Every structure is written in structure tokens, then in C-alpha cells.
């Protein structure tokens, strides 16, 4: 639904814009998300393009698909000249579908001077002014790159003074209950507490986090990003426990927000990989249990999402393989980290909950199939998967089984103990040695490494069932309606 006028406004060429406008350019027509040329130019800060389109009787109070306006995006991108021009052209204060005003938008985006101008705007109330200043301070407290402790304290103190500016009525903050994930600190209500905590930089980060959670909690806003940055800094500080709790709260909010978190889970597993590598781990398996349960819920929900709309889940399908890889890494960590009886019980509970529903992938790989092949070739991961109810006889899209892939393992001499342990574990609990895959084949025939050949050959137990199945399959004799129904599958196996 894009128009060449919109592209010209995106580029910023004034001459092209004026030439097209004088040649019957359509402005009221917007894109698929209903975005006007004025509003995209305002988001891009082209003062000349915006002031000419306003002169051309183009609607400044346009409402996007989410209710946001040009003033909203100009405030978000910190274009003071644009918001000033729009106010000159009487841009009305509009609350978007996200429940936020351009004043509040500039407050969240740390555009302090835009906030100043919008407060200078006449149509502002005391409550909106206070909330804008509080949100500005809170965002400055936890900003990734525009961080400033001095600005944070100044704006929060000014907001709190405005709360206490009137003797007859004092506005008291509707503070949220303290969060253990945040650290159980409670947002301040009086100027004295803020003056006490301004000395502690971490305490003011805490206060900003609480203010952001309170202000943006009701609205449908992704508030995890400041939590992401805060936890990243804490991990850089070796304070993993508070970092872990912060990312746990971020994942919970994302689950509330129904947003994809494959990257978040990948990072929250990569941090475990690194902190295992440094050997400073002292990892707590009970915490990993919460991660496993959360990723199980997320993967089940997104699998349902893929089932609902297959046409739009190709990226979601890729995130599905990514999530399964992250779970493989979590099992690797669980092998790395010793667990208590209850902790290991909960880990196995979550793993079994995953296994009970069969998580088919592209090419039909199951958990154990992923665990055995090169993604490497983890051993205790496969053993735990088998112990947790995975199927050794599970069939891939190509038709292979668990043993097929593992015997087809390159570099056998290295990690020979892993290969031997995997073979011994899998042949126990129901691995059929001669499962033909695709065209008639033998897992012994498929294997190309002599040592693995000797291993399974020693592990072979012969039976009339296998030998006679091979003979009947080779002779192509009709077997249906003359064989027990259970053995009908067995005949197809060979």
C-alpha cells in the first residue's frame, strides 16, 4: 500500500515532495498500517517536509492503526522542531491504543526537552505532568545508552515536589508491591526517601524500575528492555542471582505480553553456558526448573500458533528449532550441574512433560535424534532423555531411528567413550538392532565406523523374529491377513 510520496517523504527530498504535491499527490491515503506521509516525516524529523505538508492542508490529527499520531512519533524520536510545528498547527492531545500520550511518549523515550515543550503546552494536567516527569526519570534510570543518574534524580525529585507542591492535597504514588525479582525494594512516596536513595546508584535504578513497572504495567507495553539492560549489567557485575531474577520477571512479563522470546531464552541459556565455562557457576538447579517450565509453556504455545496459521510461522518455525536447541543446551547444563533429588525430580518432570508430546521437527527429528547428531553428540544428554521417556525406536521423516544416527558418527576415536556409552544405553530399554530405514538397510550396514560396528555387533541379541523378518522382506511374500497384527508392524520394521 506504499505510495511514491511516502518514499519521497522517507528519503527527505524536499524538491521531490513539492514537485509531487503540485502534481496531484494523494496524502490522505496511507499504507497498510494506515501511516501518513506527515507522520512518517515527523518520525524522521524532516522539518521542511513536515511544514510543507501541514501547509498543504494535510491532516495533522491523523490516527494510525494503533491510535498514535505524528506528534507521538516526533516525541519518540526527539524532534523538538517537529512537535513545536505540530503544536503551532494545533495538534490535539491523543491517547493511542497503547494508552499513552505524546507527553508520556517523550517521557518514555528520554527526550527531556520534548517533555519540557509538551509541559509548556497549555492542554496538560497536573497528574499528566507528574506522571510524565516520573516516567522520564524512571526511563533515564534504566536507559541503555541515554543513562544519566543526575538527570534521573533531578526529574524524579521535581516530579515528587510537584506531588507535594500543594499543601491542601498531596498526590501519593500508587506504588506496586516490592518484587523479589527486582530485589524487594519499594518505590518511594516522600522526597526524603528519594534524597536518601539518590546517593545509592543501584537504589535509584531500582526506583526507576518500580516507577516504570507501575506506570507502564497497565498498558500493553514491552517493558522488559530496561530489565534486559539492567540484568546484563548485573551479569557483568557477577551478580547473576539478581540478574537471573530480573530475566525471570522479564520472561514472565513477556508471557503476559504474549511476545516471542526465543532470543531471550537463548541469552538466558548462553549466560549459563558462560558461567559454567568460568567454573564460578554454583548453579542452582531449582532456578533451572523454572526456566525449563517456562520454555516448555512457550514452545507449546508457539507450536499451537504454528498449527493455527502455517502461512506466517516460517520465522516461528525457525524459532521452534532454536528453542529446541536452547532446551538441548539446558539439558547440557543439567548434565554439567549436579542437582538435588527434588531439583533433579523437577527437571525430569519438565523434561517428561516435553517428551510426552512428541516435538516433531523438520526431517522428523525428535529430542534424542537432535541429541545424538551433530548440531556436540552429547552423551549424558541422550542418557537423560532416554531416562525421561524418550523413544529409542522413534522414526524420523527419513525413517531412521536413534541408533541409526549415532552409529553414523564421524571422528569415532575421539569421544569414543561417549559413543560407547550412548550405544550401551540406547540398546537397553528397547532398541531394535536391525531397523531398516527408507529402502531396506541395516543400522550395522549404515554405520561406516568399524569400532561402532564392533560395539553394536557385541550388543546384538539374535532372534527368529529378526532373521525371519529379513527373509520374508527379501522374498516379498504377502504378509497381511496371515500374521498377527502386532507382528504386522514388526514385518514392516525389517
Amino acid at each position: 500500500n506504499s505510495t511514491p510520496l511516502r518514499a519521497a517523504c522517507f528519503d527527505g527530498r524536499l524538491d521531490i515532495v513539492k514537485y509531487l504535491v503540485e502534481n496531484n499527490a494523494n496524502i490522505s491515503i496511507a499504507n497498510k498500517y494506515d501511516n501518513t506521509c506527515l507522520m512518517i516525516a515527523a518520525y524522521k524529523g524532516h522539518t521542511d517536509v513536515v511544514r510543507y505538508l501541514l501547509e498543504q492542508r494535510a491532516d495533522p490529527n491523523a490516527k494510525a492503526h494503533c491510535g498514535a499520531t505524528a506528534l507521538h512519533f516526533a516525541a519518540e524520536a526527539g524532534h523538538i522542531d517537529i512537535v513545536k510545528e505540530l503544536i503551532k498547527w494545533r495538534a490535539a492531545i491523543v491517547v493511542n491504543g497503547h494508552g499513552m500520550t505524546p507527553l508520556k511518549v517523550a517521557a518514555e523515550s528520554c527526550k527531556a526537552d520534548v517533555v519540557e515543550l509538551l509541559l509548556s503546552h497549555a492542554d496538560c494536567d497536573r497528574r499528566s505532568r507528574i506522571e510524565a516527569l516520573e516516567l522520564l526519570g524512571a526511563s533515564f534510570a534504566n536507559d541503555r545508552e541515554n543513562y544519566d543518574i543526575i538527570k534521573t534524580y533531578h526529574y524524579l525529585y521535581l516530579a515528587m515536589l510537584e506531588r507535594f507542591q500543594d499543601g491542601d492535597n498531596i498526590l501519593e504514588k500508587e506504588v506496586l508491591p516490592p518484587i523479589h525479582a527486582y530485589g524487594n525494594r519499594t518505590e518511594c512516596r516522600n522526597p526524603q526517601e528519594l534524597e536518601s536513595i539518590r546517593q545509592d546508584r543501584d537504589a535509584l535504578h531500582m526506583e526507576g524500575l518500580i516507577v516504570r513497572e507501575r506506570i507502564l504495567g497497565a498498558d500493553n507495553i514491552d517493558v522488559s528492555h530496561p530489565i534486559i539492560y539492567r540484568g546484563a549489567v548485573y551479569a557483568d557485575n557477577m551478580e547473576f542471582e539478581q540478574c537471573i531474577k530480573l530475566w525471570l520477571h522479564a520472561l514472565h512479563l513477556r508471557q503476559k505480553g504474549n511476545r516471542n522470546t526465543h532470543k531471550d531464552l537463548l541469552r538466558f541459556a548462553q549466560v549459563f553456558s558462560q558461567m559454567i565455562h568460568l567454573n564460578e557457576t554454583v548453579k542452582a538447579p531449582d532456578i533451572e526448573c523454572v526456566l525449563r517450565c517456562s520454555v516448555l509453556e512457550i514452545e507449546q504455545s508457539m507450536n499451537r500458533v504454528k498449527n493455527i496459521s502455517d502461512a506466517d510461522v516460517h520465522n516461528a518455525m525457525d524459532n521452534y528449532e532454536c528453542n529446541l536447541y536452547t532446551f538441548l543446551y539446558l539439558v547440557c547444563i543439567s548434565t554439567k550441574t549436579q542437582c538435588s533429588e527434588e531439583d533433579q525430580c523437577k527437571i525430569n518432570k519438565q523434561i517428561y512433560n516435553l517428551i510426552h508430546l512428541d516435538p516433531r521437527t523438520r526431517e522428523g527429528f525428535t529430542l534424542l535424534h537432535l541429541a545424538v547428531n551433530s548440531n556436540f553428540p552429547n552423551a549424558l544428554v541422550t542418557k537423560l532423555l532416554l531416562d525421561c521417556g524418550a523413544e529409542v525406536n522413534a522414526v524420523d521423516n527419513e525413517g531412521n531411528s536413534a541408533l541409526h544416527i549415532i552409529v553414523q558418527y564421524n571422528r569415532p576415536i575421539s569421544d569414543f567413550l561417549t559413543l560407547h556409552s550412548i550405544i550401551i544405553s540406547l540398546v537397553e530399554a528397547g532398541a531394535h538392532t536391525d531397523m531398516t530405514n527408507k529402502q531396506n538397510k541395516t543400522p550395522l550396514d549404515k554405520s561406516t565406523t568399524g569400532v561402532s560396528e564392533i560395539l553394536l555387533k557385541t550388543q546384538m541379541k539374535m532372534s527368529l523374529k529378526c532373521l525371519a523378518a529379513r527373509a520374508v522382506r527379501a522374498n516379498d511374500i504377502n504378509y497381511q491377513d496371515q500374521i498377527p497384527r502386532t507382528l504386522e508392524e514388526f514385518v514392516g520394521f525389517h
Partner: peptide, 23 residues
């Protein structure tokens, strides 16, 4: 050290809060 979440937005919709997946 750390890599921030990408958060590169959809060009069609300019509303930063709106999260539109890109193919």
C-alpha cells in the same frame, strides 16, 4: 560481551511500541 536484542522495526508501521514481525 553482551548483544542487545535486535529490535529493528518494521518500516511500514512507525509506532515503536507496536511489534510487527518481519519476514
Amino acid at each position: 560481551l553482551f548483544k542487545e536484542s535486535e529490535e529493528i522495526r518494521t518500516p511500514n508501521c512507525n509506532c515503536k511500541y507496536c511489534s510487527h514481525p518481519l519476514l
